[PDB]
Design an enzyme around this catalytic site. Sequence first.
Site, PDB file in Angstrom:
ATOM      1  N   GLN A 189       0.795  -1.196   0.000  1.00 39.48           N
ATOM      2  CA  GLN A 189       0.000   0.000   0.000  1.00 39.48           C
ATOM      3  C   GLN A 189       0.840   1.263   0.000  1.00 39.48           C
ATOM      4  OE1 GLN A 189      -3.194  -2.201   2.876  1.00 39.48           O
ATOM      5  NE2 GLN A 189      -3.314  -0.007   2.758  1.00 39.48           N
ATOM      6  N   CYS A 231      -9.340   1.173   9.959  1.00 39.29           N
ATOM      7  CA  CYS A 231      -9.367   1.766  11.262  1.00 39.29           C
ATOM      8  C   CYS A 231      -9.017   3.231  11.310  1.00 39.29           C
ATOM      9  CB  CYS A 231      -8.549   1.010  12.264  1.00 39.29           C
ATOM     10  SG  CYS A 231      -6.767   1.223  12.345  1.00 39.29           S
TER      11      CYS A 231
END
EC number: 1.2.5.3
Lengths: 796, 152, 46, 159, 161, 286
Positions: free
Chosen positions: A227, A375
Amino acid sequence: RAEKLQGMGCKRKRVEDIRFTQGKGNYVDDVKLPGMLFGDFVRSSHAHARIKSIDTSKAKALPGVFAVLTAADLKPLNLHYMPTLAGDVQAVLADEKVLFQNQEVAFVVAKDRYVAADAIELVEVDYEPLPVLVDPFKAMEPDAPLLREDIKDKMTGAHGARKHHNHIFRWEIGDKEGTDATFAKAEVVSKDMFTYHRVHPSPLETCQCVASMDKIKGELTLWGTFQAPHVIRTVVSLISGLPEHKIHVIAPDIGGGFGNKVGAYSGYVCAVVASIVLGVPVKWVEDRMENLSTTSFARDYHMTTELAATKDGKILAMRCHVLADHGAFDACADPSKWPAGFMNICTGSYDMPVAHLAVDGVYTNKASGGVAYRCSFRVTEAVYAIERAIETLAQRLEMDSADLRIKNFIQPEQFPYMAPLGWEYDSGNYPLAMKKAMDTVGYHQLRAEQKAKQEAFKRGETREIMGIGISFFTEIVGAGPSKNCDILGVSMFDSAEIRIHPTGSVIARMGTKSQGQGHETTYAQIIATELGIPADDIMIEEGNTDTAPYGLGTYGSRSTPTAGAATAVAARKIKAKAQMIAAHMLEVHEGDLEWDVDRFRVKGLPEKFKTMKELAWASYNSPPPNLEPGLEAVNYYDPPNMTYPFGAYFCIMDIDVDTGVAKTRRFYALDDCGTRINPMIIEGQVHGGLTEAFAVAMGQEIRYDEQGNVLGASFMDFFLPTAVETPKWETDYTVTPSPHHPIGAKGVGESPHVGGVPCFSNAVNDAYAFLNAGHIQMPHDAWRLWKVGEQLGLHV
Amino acid sequence: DSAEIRIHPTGSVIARMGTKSQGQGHETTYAQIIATELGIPADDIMIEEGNTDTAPYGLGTYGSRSTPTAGAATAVAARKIKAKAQMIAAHMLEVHEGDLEWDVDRFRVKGLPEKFKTMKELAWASYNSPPPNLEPGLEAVNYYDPPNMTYP
Amino acid sequence: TVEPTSAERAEKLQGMGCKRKRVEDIRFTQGKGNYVDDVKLPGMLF
Amino acid sequence: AKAHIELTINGHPVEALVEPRTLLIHFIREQQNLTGAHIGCDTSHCGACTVDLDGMSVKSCTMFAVQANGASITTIEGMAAPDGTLSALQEGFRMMHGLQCGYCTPGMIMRSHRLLQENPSPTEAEIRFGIGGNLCRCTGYQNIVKAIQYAAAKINGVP
Amino acid sequence: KAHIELTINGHPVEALVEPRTLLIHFIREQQNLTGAHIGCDTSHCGACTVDLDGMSVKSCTMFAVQANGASITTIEGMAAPDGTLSALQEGFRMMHGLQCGYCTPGMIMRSHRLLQENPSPTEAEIRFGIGGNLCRCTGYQNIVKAIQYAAAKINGVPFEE
Amino acid sequence: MIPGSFDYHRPKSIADAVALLTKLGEDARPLAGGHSLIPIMKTRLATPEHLVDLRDIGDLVGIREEGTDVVIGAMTTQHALIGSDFLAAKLPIIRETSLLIADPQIRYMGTIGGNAANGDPGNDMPALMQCLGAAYELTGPEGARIVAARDYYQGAYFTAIEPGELLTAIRIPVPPTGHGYAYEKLKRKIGDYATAAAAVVLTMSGGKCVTASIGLTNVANTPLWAEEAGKVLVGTALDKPALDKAVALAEAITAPASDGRGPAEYRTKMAGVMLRRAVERAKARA
Ligand SMILES: Cc1cc2nc3c(=O)[nH]c(=O)nc-3n(C[C@H](O)[C@H](O)[C@H](O)COP(=O)(O)OP(=O)(O)OC[C@H]3O[C@@H](n4cnc5c(N)ncnc54)[C@H](O)[C@@H]3O)c2cc1C
Ligand SMILES: Nc1ccn([C@@H]2O[C@H](COP(=O)(O)OP(=O)(O)OC[C@H]3Oc4nc5nc(N)nc(O)c5nc4C(S)=C3S)[C@@H](O)[C@H]2O)c(=O)n1
Ligand code: FES
Ligand code: FES
Ligand code: FES
Ligand code: FES
């Protein structure tokens, strides 16, 4: 021209879909390079044990096995541990001891994954069991086992003193004295311990890489599920000694990340080492059971959460202390200054005078992680804490919890709002959204229906109970300002580079990396609007660290806040230069020009104009002598603040008390992420995140038993809903732009999970509230809800 | 012709040009230009040409033009980076830019040579501690429209 | 050295005016250039 | 003692030598380089590996290549028409935003291909149940249902 | 197709080839040893030179079948396993004996054999000794120097300047 | 994920498959739809040296009525069971059950015989077959024999089948026309093995139950036939007293695992609830 633009706001269909619907994505395991080997791990059968001996002899002797690395090989390279984002280290291959079940012990490299699997079975590890620690609540007891012997005689870790060998950090923020004073005198103190159980992001593609050290050139190429590929490059440089310009990280198409693919894993390091040793490529692809049990978990916060209030329902303070179970190594992704992430957004959407938050992280004999799975750096936890606390407080106040929220919302005129744990919320119109939501779901009618149903239950007329879950949440996304947000010292900016070709098409790259969020579609829409260039005339790329400008990657819903901003800013740099070219062409002052969709016109002589297309050509063909030729720009965007999207989510849940089976009746999700670049994409993001929230709240878990066995870490047990279980989603929005963002756009991708879990859990808790169940800990699967009813005497 | 130069956090460099060597040693020699300009060893610089997706637009290599055109652009782009680095240095060292002098690979404070920032340190700083007024990172492009030919 | 002189630092640059040996030579002397006819793609015809 | 197999994949003859233990998914991906099909799990739940095999939707990670000897398989690469035109399903998935990361998509489309042969005009409940073997992490399924409905409408308009 | 077994760069090779396949194409197209190059269609340039059973051979002027049982070294085979470049490879870099690199594999492979023929050649012997290898870039002067360098390296003593 | 190596066989007949199995002994396993075996090979719980694929044996596939029975070949797939309108006419419980097994892909491959022979108490068909009083036709090197489904299961992966045998068919007595039936399964999601499930068939006359039979799935280390529980329904109106007694007698024989589906006590109760619901649906059908 109008049809073709497909700029901001359009439900532009995705460019990625062409390849993906045809199987022409390029994901890591699709990579095949000459000579490429496959590596995978021998993994620990023990949660906690000394490694007496590793016998690799039989594995090495197996035909087709090229290497079996153990810690003894890595040490010399100082690679038997690797740094983490949390400022700890994590064992790459276990050296003296194993600390979690399925931990990497040896890395077998073989001709292919079948041989590798065979050879793994041949490695024999002798263990000397040590006492297992799985209960974080016991981690700091005087006889708790010493897990991290490697850093045992270091009472100060990367986040301050450690008061106990299993204590990672203690982090506090907020006004303790003021908070304590408020709690000491408040009329109502509403306390609960909310556990946000361990779950896992479980992207459908697991973590994997292909490392290829070119020993002739002295250059490493590393394909991987990253990522944050530039960060990976820099880390790989610092730990390998190869210079960055000789490390070519490539994050290709990624089959979902959901936070699982931010950090480094042992697999990447071992594949790299193996490739450096062997001088041929080494692929590593983990299987699901290892993905679930050895890569970043999410959650595992035990949140003692208190609200102080007046009896009339004004919230006076929040006091929260968290016990964070980080597993064996602190590999919890976070900006370096924030060991509990942005848990300090836990005062949520409410205007409270004071608050205090404390978080202790502890080691246990488990996989590492914590921050993953939408999150936003512990914002799931923060929001769960507050939105559950709102409900338990409302119960204690005998107040409708929608009314309690409405009484306490931060009001729109308060923005930018400095919250009591330090974050300054950018913009929000909470009452409007809450009202829209309540009106849409017929909230007051629901409550009357619920009351009637409860009475029917008490009369033995129904075995179903109805819950109404509310989650009104403030997210914080877009990490972040350089002042306070850095990933291991790299400020959390992001970037865009846009280059216009002579004939007016565009290549643009960004420092982010999609794992399905549609960047290749949506970044072009930003440019399209800014420059009047059809989106299809724009190519977006990410993920190749040689070519994309440096950025910090995609996570924390940061892409739109950071690289989306950079995109607009860079486009505006181009536009400004185009204006100068137009002025030169039209023989007017720049100040005489105005932009009109795709051209500069001369004020008052609207017939005199140059299109962006003509200007691009002019930049090559007739470059004004004052100016450089060409037409391109870069921006590295250091955000001034986070963005704070918000939402109002309502769930109606029916529960069969006899089985514990809950059925979502309706789920309404209003998200406001400011300017909406592509409503279609946002909607999809929401559907996906709500589905995760449903999963987390209603079923998903990773557990450990007292021996440290990891339980439920396969799709035999790990609840991933199918289309049958997944509710229909009703989505809605308001638009409250971010004032500071170049296009007013906030992040959104994590919002649905952040808001959704409390919504579901609140609905379940609310269903049983009339029966005085108290806080029901997630997940709310059928056996657990059966137990609730059993313990309430519903079954006899 | 053109050059784009990007300095990584750890101080190595990727640079590309709009020319295309066919053996004239550009991958070596462009890095030499940059190395002198920036005080980054040539070996820490990767030069690429020829991939139109990635290299800045240029007109190619012919007419002995690479040094006149992209070599110029390389210098000019590198000087843009140096200028930014000087700004970073001045910020870090808490002096005016006019108070700095270049010594091969670092800015020193005039009169106070013990106070200095190397280009390597500045490159890291540009990522780690970007001065508030500046964008992070350390890179530049130049497209160089020559004023005349050169007449060797 | 750890505190090289200006001249030493300049020398180490191998910058302007240096007879810097070529980076290209590493691959080319080992047949690891990539020239067009070295390219092979799936399905490629001639 | 590799086994020789002959089968048809996407309308083309294939012949290969395989170990009996080679899972069909690996044969397809690794030997045939048909990397559309994906592996998402190690327990046969996810369906990312679904191919259409002799008129069936099969999880190719739960079959050995040797079991597919003589079979006719379609993988996602086989769905587009010879002239390149996307199948109704492929088009529907794009039009309806039925994918994001794309990792489940090949399997979803392959399953759906068979679903719409089983039932050309399915209700939503039929669709959802009919794709119960296929997990998606990104979409929450809602747009996949739309995609399948869209495709059914297109198909049902063809004749 | 013909079945051949041979050794290339010290490794056994077994293959099926059409008889008409030129060795250069077998090496490049089937073995993927793409160092060797084609520069001509008339056997003048030497870019295709490999070392084959102790000879310098223009592999564009031999069929792969003719190399059945042969030991071939191509440029890929010259560097040591430890990564250390051969004396010639080093000399070519040190003396700037290549530019585009296209002749270099053949030049080095020829020179490898030249220096076995004549470990201490004069300049005239070098120039003559590489007469089968054309270079467009260098004008040969530095190639001569490269070979001299390599010879002096190998020999442990210089000969000519 | 990666199984151990094995040799693969494709016998052409039952006799050949039995001969193979008998010759190769214990290290050989029949391979039917593979959707239990391959998964446990991939974990290396199973490491057979030989797989004997039954694919080419046509006589193992089919559904026919013979006398008072329906006989279903062992290799008949779930999909085929579901598709059979003749089975739906005679034994509609089967389609109902099958649609609760696994998922479409698995049902395309998984067979009734593999479901019945597997000996994982998770499988749904065993207790259904016990409910129905099915008989399993086994052929081995010593010839044919029949083992009642009710007698077939001893434990997890422990069944009455003997070395070298194949289960060739399942012979199912056809319930009376108008019988009630239901298979009621509680599970975590599509594809999951039951937390508990109950199979019921029953017939009524004059508002009173004339026959009842109950199977319980995945609430012991075997399927269970709840003989007492069925008996107690007979002669009753299938009212609450009757169902309570049946539930008691059914729960009493459970001994469920405590696993991700919940603890044994929950699963025991869920056996009862599934029973109740299945009896109710059966009653309404009857
Ligand atoms: C993800 C998933 C979900 C599932 N969910 C369910 C579920 O909800 N309920 C359910 O009932 N099943 C479920 N199953 C199991 C599935 O139904 C299997 O198909 C079944 O258990 C085995 O049948 P099979 O034909 O696939 O047999 P195989 O896997 O081929 O064989 C299973 C076993 O039986 C033996 N065997 C097979 N046929 C014979 C025979 N004729 N004679 C002797 N021995 C034989 C084999 O040797 C092996 O020991 C699920 C499977 C998966 C992968
Ligand atoms: N104001 C906005 C905000 C977003 N968008 C669009 O929505 C998408 C998501 O943008 P953003 O909210 O900026 O989030 P990111 O792109 O940074 O995605 C990260 C986020 O993405 C989520 N959704 C995911 N979806 C898929 N398919 N795959 C993941 O791995 C995902 N992981 C998660 C998790 S975890 C995270 S952190 C982008 O195309 C964006 O243009 C928009 O149209 N307008
Ligand atoms: S990879 Fe086949 S079902 Fe998951
Ligand atoms: S599109 Fe990502 S798993 Fe379905
Ligand atoms: S290619 Fe062989 S001599 Fe020219
Ligand atoms: S180096 Fe170019 S042909 Fe010799």
